[PDB]
Amino acid sequence: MAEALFKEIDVNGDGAVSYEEVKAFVSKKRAIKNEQLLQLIFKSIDADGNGEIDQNEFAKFYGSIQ
Numbered sequence: 001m002a003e004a005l006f007k008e009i010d011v012n013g014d015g016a017v018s019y020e021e022v023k024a025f026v027s028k029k030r031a032i033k034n035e036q037l038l039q040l041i042f043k044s045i046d047a048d049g050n051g052e053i054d055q056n057e058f059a060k061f062y063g064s065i066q
């Protein structure tokens, strides 16, 4: 219900979540192996898609307020 979830999932306190981090987030709710969805969603959720999505990018992406 906020952006804190993005940083919360980042146990490494890096403020960035890569494709793996994303797939893991949803994996915590169930078991759904999506190679295509992961790749597409990875670049989609990532503003710059630079290996991982930064906290700032996620915030601005939340709600598609770009």
Ligand SMILES: [Ca+2]
Pocket: 009, 010, 011, 012, 013, 014, 015, 016, 017, 018, 021
């Ligand atoms: Ca992280």
Ligand SMILES: [Ca+2]
Pocket: 016, 046, 047, 048, 049, 050, 051, 052, 053, 054, 057
């Ligand atoms: Ca990034």
